[PDB]
Description:
PDB class: hydrolase/hydrolase inhibitor
Structural class of chain D: mainly beta
Shape of chain D: rod-shaped
Assembly: hexameric
Entry title: Structure of human neutrophil elastase in complex with a peptide chloromethyl ketone inhibitor at 1.84-angstroms resolution
Chains A, B, C: human leucocyte elastase
Keywords: hydrolase-hydrolase inhibitor complex
Number of strands of chain D: 1
CATH class of the largest domain in chain A: Mainly Beta
Oligomer: heterohexamer
Radius of gyration of chain A: 16 Å
Amino acid sequence: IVGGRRARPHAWPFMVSLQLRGGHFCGATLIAPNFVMSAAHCVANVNVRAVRVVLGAHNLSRREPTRQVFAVQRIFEDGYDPVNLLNDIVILQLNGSATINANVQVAQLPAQGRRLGNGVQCLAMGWGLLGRNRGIASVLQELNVTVVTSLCRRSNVCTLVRGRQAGVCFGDSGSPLVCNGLIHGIASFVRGGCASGLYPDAFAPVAQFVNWIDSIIQ
Amino acid sequence: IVGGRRARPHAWPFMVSLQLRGGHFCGATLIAPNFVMSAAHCVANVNVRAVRVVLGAHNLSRREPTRQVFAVQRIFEDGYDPVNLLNDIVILQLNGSATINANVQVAQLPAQGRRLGNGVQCLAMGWGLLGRNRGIASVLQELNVTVVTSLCRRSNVCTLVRGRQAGVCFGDSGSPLVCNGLIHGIASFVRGGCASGLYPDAFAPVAQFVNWIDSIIQ
Amino acid sequence: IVGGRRARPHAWPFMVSLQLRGGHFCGATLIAPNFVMSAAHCVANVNVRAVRVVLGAHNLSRREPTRQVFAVQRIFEDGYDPVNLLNDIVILQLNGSATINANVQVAQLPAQGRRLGNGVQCLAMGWGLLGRNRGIASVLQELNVTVVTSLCRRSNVCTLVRGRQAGVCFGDSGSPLVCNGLIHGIASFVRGGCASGLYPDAFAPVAQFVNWIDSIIQ
Amino acid sequence: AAPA
Amino acid sequence: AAPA
Amino acid sequence: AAPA
Lengths: 218, 218, 218, 4, 4, 4
């Protein structure tokens, strides 16, 4: 996240970090005790059996007793299209169930087909790049964004920070977009570099996949 | 435009701004009282019926009585190829005719087949990004560039600012390249980011489309 | 190269500069007195008969008596795939044989099939971009990197500078990756911009092409 | 577009 | 190449 | 990926 602020510790208990060594590469959202939702492109050319799913984290550079670490057992994809970047969503089944507590909780999803119009105020968040100065963030960042149609496709939810250069960046993919307390987006792609000040950020529209998610989840 | 200078107000009366809200996204050139020429990619995945064509502008953040606003009535494409970025030119017919005055005038085109060799000195201009600091420019910018073949395709006119990092950027597409007082290029694409200091900027070669333009224009 | 250091003059006598005017655009490695090895993408859409092969250079902005300049006589490709960026290697036969001396020497290659695991320490080098401030470097730069698998394909050798933003950049393609004194990589591509601090740099794995090289070389 |  |  |  570029131009955002540190989140209050454990303010978003559904926030997940996907790691390869002990290196964060994508975010995710806890949707059930044993399932996380992320962007398909995050797991496309990665060694899935090597991915660690980190729950209850705040500061990645610190030892945090609040953490819960899981492995990936199965992957559920919908119609991921890497050329067009459509259906950039994946469900990952954990090798166990999280211990729900103050620091780890399940996110609330929107109803199927609910669409956001121009002007809805939402919060983006992630541990991605801070700009081109600053690599990945250590502490979770959050950012107020506005939904915009316009320089956006009907197949995405796009956002823009008006009047300043701010936005999601590499490493933010898979992280939630929260609007009116529900998960409405999954960070998918940028255009013109991160925080162009032109080109809205693009998210996978979770409302369009609710029926599918449920079918797997419950 | 990166590394350029503010243009004298109304110095280039054929310069047009294409907008979606009241947000500039691409430039264009007035070629007749009721037709503007831009880059095909600017209108590719945009809601055409939502585009505003702004004539006689200088400072986009200001109320300017000199302005004339038109809608798009029809689009004329030639063989736009989005994979290869070839034929990145479009003609847009206005829903009316501009009032020609000191601030709004038609541009002069080159003769069909006229080709520019290495070393021709030209001026690029636009309201695109100023760098990655600075979003879109408020005031029209202009920049002296040199034509170069070399790291360029025969199907484009390429330019480079020697010895400093300067060039066109996002938002500059569709803007004219003026050489010896004629419109020789339409800003099309960058490589390696904006002002690489390596990779020349690429323009659609207007001289190669003159016969076509006329056929529509007159 | 971003975040590297000036190399000691003539420390790497197998280092080559490929130029178009008197402008460096890609590196290469001397593999025999009359053959240089580079990245296929460097010569893909270039006027080969216009390329100058510069041997024994250190400071490109200076007149250097140590230099030897050759033209390209023939090109040998293996299965360059521009969509997937696979087999990004080319052999260029010189119009003559270099004069071997203190400043111009042939590089040592690895044995066929030798693979590097995570943690091998190597040196990358080149005259490419210094960052987005600073165009191409005048003086050869070198950089300590570490081999990593992870966010890498089996078809590449990837590297990463841990804890700081550093890496290869545009203009570095074709330059050698030296590990334990042997040429193990040819700089091929970056992801997320140059020195992301996320995304390892990708090199063509020379060990996988040794049999082929020899077949041509000797 | 660059997938993030 | 990135269309501008 | 951007070829360098």
